[PDB]
């Protein structure tokens, strides 16, 4: 199985640089060009450049030939992109992807979320959302006060069809707020334990929050 595995999300300060990685497995690394692309929230894709790991040659979008440096390490089957002298507008999801026949992009990494900001990395506070004192009951979790993106939310629950909604985060004053709802049969809760599990890879933290009924 071909896999491209990208490095994790990072926060970088304005004026500094970032280097991210794209680890290739399951095929002959040196036989295929890898492309690097940028995607800002709510926009299309912008190509930065490519690396040919066969001969170590890289080609750049003229826009990026100063800022970007693409390298690869044959020893570890890993391509890297360095972006230098960063500013707020370098904040984006960055993809590595494999060049296939007729230069279509067949396998893709999962994306690396880069945030460029003066703000501090801060782990989330997670709060249970339980009804105040029907056959279905909606519960949730409120994920507040974190930076940067992303967080992931997974539920342990008896949720029904179309019963889990995790809302895109909203930024305010250098801190994100995210929420997630789960709708479960009222026989299952508070009887069975419902837990929202939040991960924030940028701070290397998680939270396992049990939804307890209000007393």
């Amino acid at each position: 199985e071909v896999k491209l595995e990208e490095s994790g999300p990072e926060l970088v300060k304005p004026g500094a640089s970032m280097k991210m990685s794209c680890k290739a497995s399951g095929y002959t690394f040196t036989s295929y060009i890898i492309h690097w692309l940028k995607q800002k929230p709510g926009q299309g894709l912008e190509w930065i450049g490519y690396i040919n790991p066969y001969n170590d040659g890289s080609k750049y979008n003229e826009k990026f030939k100063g800022k970007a440096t693409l390298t690869s390490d044959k020893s570890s089957s890993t391509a890297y992109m360095e972006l230098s002298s960063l500013a707020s507008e370098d904040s984006a999801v960055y993809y590595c992807t494999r060049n296939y026949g007729s230069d279509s992009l067949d396998y893709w990494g999962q994306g690396t979320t880069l945030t460029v900001s003066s703000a501090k990395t801060t782990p989330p506070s997670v709060y249970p959302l339980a009804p105040g004192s029907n056959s279905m009951v909606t519960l949730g979790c409120l994920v507040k006060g974190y930076f940067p993106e992303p967080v992931t939310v997974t539920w342990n629950s008896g949720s029904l069809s179309s019963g889990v909604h995790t809302f895109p985060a909203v930024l305010q004053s250098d801190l994100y707020t995210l929420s997630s709802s789960v709708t479960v049969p009222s026989s299952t809760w508070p009887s069975e334990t419902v837990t929202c599990n939040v991960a924030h890879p940028a701070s290397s933290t998680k939270v396992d929050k049990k939804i307890v009924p209000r007393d």
Partner: protein
């Protein structure tokens, strides 16, 4: 090379034929013209390569055609899993470029929001903040207005709203509205009401929480 995709946004009911176009500002070889599909929060997927060849796993209801500057992706029968953003791609010249996207949505029957309100957790109250959360779940169409009332007066400051994209199964939207106050401000009022206005009801769909009942 600029690629302009049209329409930017469109909706189709199930079973309807859908065609979207990508127009290039310069001629591009059909061998180096490709399409991708992207769903919210996920990487793009190769969808069509060299104008008309379907990638591995792509349903046969999709096709592609074109040459010169005008290319199209056609879907013979709209199905629920087809709601996504579609991007065109040329690699006739370096740098390769991509379209701004056609976001294809699924039309479906009107659905009223199911409204749920939640007071601040005891845990949040130790932080000096207090958030009241309102979920408005599984509604259609997307157009909705949410109002917060505190003891009868509208509150507009400290409100964060977020919407999901169409649910994979039922194709409805959901929305979260979070009112955040200081704990001091939170404790000066009794009742917090979230009120939803949606085309499915001439009356708002509302829920309230009172501090004295809890």
């Amino acid at each position: 090379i600029v690629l302009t995709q049209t329409p930017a946004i469109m909706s189709a009911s199930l079973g309807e034929r859908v065609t979207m176009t990508c127009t290039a500002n310069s001629s591009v070889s059909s061998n180096y013209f490709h399409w991708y599909q992207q769903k919210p929060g996920s990487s793009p997927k190769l969808w069509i390569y060299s104008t008309s060849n379907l990638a591995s796993g792509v349903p046969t209801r999709f096709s592609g055609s074109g040459s010169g500057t005008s290319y199209s992706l056609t879907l013979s029968s709209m199905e629920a899993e087809d709601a996504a953003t579609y991007y065109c791609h040329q690699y006739h010249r370096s740098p390769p470029t991509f379209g701004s996207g056609t976001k294809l949505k699924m039309k479906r029957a009107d659905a009223a929001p199911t409204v749920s309100i939640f007071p601040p957790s005891s845990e949040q109250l130790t932080s000096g903040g207090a958030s009241v959360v309102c979920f408005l779940n599984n509604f259609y169409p997307k157009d909705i207005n949410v109002k917060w009332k505190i003891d009868g007066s509208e509150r507009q400051n400290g409100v964060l709203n977020s919407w999901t994209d169409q649910d994979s199964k039922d194709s409805t939207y959901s929305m979260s509205s979070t009112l955040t106050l200081t704990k001091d401000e939170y404790e000066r009022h009794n009742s917090y009401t979230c009120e939803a206005t949606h085309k499915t009801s001439t009356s708002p769909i509302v829920k309230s929480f009172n501090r004295n009942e809890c």
